């Protein structure tokens, strides 16, 4: 908890920096869809799409 | 293969087969998009699987077996 | 120290010239080797 | 009181040919399954020595965590 | 050197002999490690030297001798 008595000066507020409407994990970068098995399945928002077309963000998981 | 021209001035070489639907890898010239060339044609683990005859899982290519 | 240029004189310190060629064996390498 | 107790058995080492050099195992090699449910490791802690013209080979593990899950 | 489908449905191809502890040029995908391609196989120079026949230091290959 922290009240407003020990605020000595603020800025804070909301930013359209980062967009993004499709997000997927892919694995690792030696499997591939045409000499093996799936590749990724990546979800989106119906109406988020509309404003924001088809962006991605990809990420890539050594773990799988 | 290999491709030339002889003292006399014809022309030699060779036209390797071509196939449709084939994986081929690809790099572009200068690292800039829009100008193609193929290096090499590389199948599908199950076609490779299907047209080779060796049973061995592995093993050591020095082993006389 | 400045006679004839000479500078420091701990400029070539111990380790200037002391060294040895590198190889491995120092860490990780020599654990399997303990025969 | 006895703490708790190191799991540990015998595996099986199999080859694809018969071997033909004396191979060395050092203690402390690894060993895993692959099975998502059990992720629990295992290691050695005696060398052993491959004899030469040899198919198989049987060494024991024993497992890092101690409980049920060994 | 090929593979393919023929419209009957066959698979057809080619399985070059592959050789422990020749070198081999490598190409990632992307430029991202972990995703190796190997292009073609290159032989050391004694190994290259070994497997010619050619007695000749050099000259330009339009010469008729």
């Known amino acids: 908890k922290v009240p407003t008595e020990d605020f000595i000066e603020e800025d804070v507020g909301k930013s359209d920096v980062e967009t993004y409407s499709i997000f997927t994990a892919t694995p690792a970068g030696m499997l591939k869809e045409l000499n093996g098995d799936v590749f990724s399945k990546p979800q989106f928002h119906p109406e988020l799409t509309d404003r924001y077309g088809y962006t991605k963000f990809e990420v890539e998981n050594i773990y799988l | 293969s290999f491709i030339g021209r002889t003292p006399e001035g014809s022309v030699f070489g060779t036209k390797p087969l071509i196939t449709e639907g084939s994986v081929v890898l690809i790099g572009f010239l200068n690292d800039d998009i829009n100008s193609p060339i193929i290096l090499s044609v590389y199948g599908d683990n199950e076609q490779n699987k299907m047209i080779n005859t060796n049973p061995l899982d592995g093993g050591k290519f020095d082993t006389e077996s | 120290i400045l006679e004839d240029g000479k500078g420091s004189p701990h400029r070539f310190a111990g380790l200037w010239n002391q060294s040895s060629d590198f190889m491995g064996g120092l860490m990780g390498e020599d654990t399997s080797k303990e025969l | ?70």
């Open chain 4, 1 to 70: 009181k006895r703490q708790s107790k190191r799991a540990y058995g015998d595996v099986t080492i199999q080859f694809y040919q018969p071997l033909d050099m004396r191979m060395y195992i050092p203690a402390g090699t690894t060993f895993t399954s692959t099975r998502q449910e059990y992720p629990q490791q295992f290691e050695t802690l005696v060398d052993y020595y491959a004899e030469p013209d040899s198919t198989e080979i049987v060494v024991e593990v024993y497992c890092k965590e101690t409980g049920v899950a060994g």
